[PDB]
Design a protein around this ligand. Sequence first.
Ligand code: HEM
Ligand code: HEM
Ligand code: HEM
Ligand code: HEM
Ligand SMILES: O=C(CSc1nnc(-c2c[nH]c3ccccc23)o1)Nc1ccc(C(=O)O)cc1
Ligand SMILES: O=C(CSc1nnc(-c2c[nH]c3ccccc23)o1)Nc1ccc(C(=O)O)cc1
Lengths: 141, 141, 145, 145
Amino acid sequence: VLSPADKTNVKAAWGKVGAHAGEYGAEALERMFLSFPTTKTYFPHFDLSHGSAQVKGHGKKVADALTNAVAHVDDMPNALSALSDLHAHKLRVDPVNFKLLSHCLLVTLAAHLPAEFTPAVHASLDKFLASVSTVLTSKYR
Amino acid sequence: VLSPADKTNVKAAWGKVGAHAGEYGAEALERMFLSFPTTKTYFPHFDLSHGSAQVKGHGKKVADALTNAVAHVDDMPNALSALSDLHAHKLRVDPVNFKLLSHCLLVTLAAHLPAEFTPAVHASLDKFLASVSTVLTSKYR
Amino acid sequence: HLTPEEKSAVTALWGKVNVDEVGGEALGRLLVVYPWTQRFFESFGDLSTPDAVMGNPKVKAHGKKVLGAFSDGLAHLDNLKGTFATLSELHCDKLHVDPENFRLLGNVLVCVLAHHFGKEFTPPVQAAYQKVVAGVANALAHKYH
Amino acid sequence: HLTPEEKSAVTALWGKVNVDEVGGEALGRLLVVYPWTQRFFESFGDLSTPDAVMGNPKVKAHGKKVLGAFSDGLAHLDNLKGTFATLSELHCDKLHVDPENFRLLGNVLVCVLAHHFGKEFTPPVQAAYQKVVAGVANALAHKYH
Ligand code: HEM
Ligand code: HEM
Ligand code: HEM
Ligand code: HEM
Ligand SMILES: O=C(CSc1nnc(-c2c[nH]c3ccccc23)o1)Nc1ccc(C(=O)O)cc1
Ligand SMILES: O=C(CSc1nnc(-c2c[nH]c3ccccc23)o1)Nc1ccc(C(=O)O)cc1
């Protein structure tokens, strides 16, 4: 559960990400596939090589979902209802994988935001990604 | 995040517990202290012996809090905010302990309500206890 | 570790376990309560609802094998890592099951025992069984360690 | 189980890691991001705000020891479990730290290396470090296995 300060921090940090959101989504996926190779079992069709168009494309979709979650932070079950159906009901993703991707998104933000990735921002983003992850791993409709 | 069926199941199962709530809360605490002795670190000055009046009284408090959470399943951050203050802000309980208590509460219910503890009801209670645990471990005010 | 009196109380209760039911009920509850686990068992057919899971004969048959592995553990509490070595390779090296899920299945088994035994599944008896299922989960996860 | 190329990458980056500060940064961030961990550090004094934590001299001094332990692991990658035996007994048998918190601190450290090294902290360099922090956490948790 997010505090007012967390919501401010998330909106400010994601604002700093701005137009790079898609790039960062893609890099986070790449980091995840290299660090935690079992996650690749969810994307076997995909070309998972460095510079992959498929990873670039997927990364943009992930990023846009996160932007949507930020804009609807007080309405996440509703905003992410179709993504929850996909991840929790259809794909049955093991929740551990959300911890892995969330970590890799934090690493990616840390690597790109050396002037803005403060401890408080880190904290708020970690909570935000836990909240998103909880919605996407829940079947509630 | 709970589905409508989860909410129905939880209200029905906890409604069946009824007047047993405190007894079953105390039994769950006892199960937890015996099964997972590291949890006693949170209660260092308590009498945790079998039959303990302090465990009985604490069990009633936990049980009443759950009753409140069940009634206010769609308003839990508000309803449980003082308990979040207590567990997240003051005691700083490590979240793993919530898994352990939650487990012991499910064991207790299984042992006492064989007809009501169906797989679906077990699943819904696990999700409900996770939601309660998330509120109590979060700092959001 | 289990004390002698714990080991005795464990083996007495285990002797009364319905060997055709308890395993499949534990596996079924795992799949219902922790639905992501169904991804490992898709080949078992219809797991689309709680009742479908619990009425699935492959779940029942597989559960009987799982129960048998627990029985084998109970007969080898001083050597769980050796007893489960090949099972560990299957679950870690081949299936890549997250080890938290081993703990979840152990705890679901404890719930099923409580369900069957009621008041006879006392807090001390539970504590003994928790050591058992922790040992088994740890032994299954040995190939990750 | 790092490739030779992964070993040189890990070694090269680590030689640039400031021993006086990176550990304190990782511990500080652990205390801010995962507030329950503060319960283990009551003797450290003021942890009331992020600024209090990150300026706290006891967090910095302790973090230097944590970082020194990681340095030790890096010098003994083929025997992390032995390297960490004494610390494993402290953390598991005495302090009863939940092992997930070992993984959390390892991951915080990776976030700290990323912050510091930016473009140098490439996905393949991360992957090598992830094997290291997984091995350290596993070694620290040995006494639970
Ligand atoms: C922050 C967490 C996550 C977000 C916001 C997210 C978002 C998305 C989005 C937006 C889609 C595309 C939906 C569409 O095209 O209609 C998607 C698809 C998918 N996601 Fe995720 N996801 C997350 C975590 C995960 C994780 C942890 C995994 C597995 C490791 C995963 C596996 C997949 C798969 C397999 C697909 C379908 C891919 C395809 O068919 O192209 N997701 N996700
Ligand atoms: C379902 C989860 C939980 C609920 C509903 C809950 C509820 C409560 C309530 C209502 C109180 C106030 C007692 C009073 O006013 O006398 C309380 C206090 C407390 N809780 Fe929890 N609690 C939960 C989980 C936990 C866990 C997992 C731990 C630690 C293992 C814990 C440790 C404590 C402690 C140490 C106190 C203060 C006891 C005292 O010193 O008097 N709680 N809890
Ligand atoms: C923690 C205790 C567990 C025990 C004692 C156990 C035991 C076993 C046994 C005895 C087998 C049969 C091996 C054979 O036929 O040679 C097996 C197979 C299997 N187990 Fe487990 N297991 C455990 C946990 C899990 C968990 C948590 C998962 C997944 C979430 C899992 C997934 C599987 C799968 C997919 C198979 C192959 C089944 C098939 O398709 O026939 N197991 N396990
Ligand atoms: C995962 C990597 C970790 C490493 C490498 C690490 C390393 C160390 C080292 C080197 C010491 C000092 C030992 C000595 O002076 O004899 C120490 C002490 C300690 N560690 Fe850790 N630790 C880790 C994780 C954690 C976590 C996650 C917690 C708690 C949440 C924790 C809590 C402590 C405590 C309380 C002490 C003793 C502090 C004191 O009394 O001065 N450690 N650790
Ligand atoms: O933080 C958010 C939106 S993002 C998010 N993460 N977890 C939840 C959440 C809402 N209700 C739940 C029930 C149980 C478990 C978690 C949740 O929400 N909402 C939110 C924050 C503060 C309050 C308040 O101070 O009353 C109310 C609402
Ligand atoms: O299930 C509940 C109450 S109990 C609970 N557990 N987690 C949450 C929760 C609410 N908002 C969050 C934000 C992020 C992470 C988790 C949460 O709530 N509410 C709930 C259920 C379904 C819907 C819907 O279909 O739109 C909306 C709301």
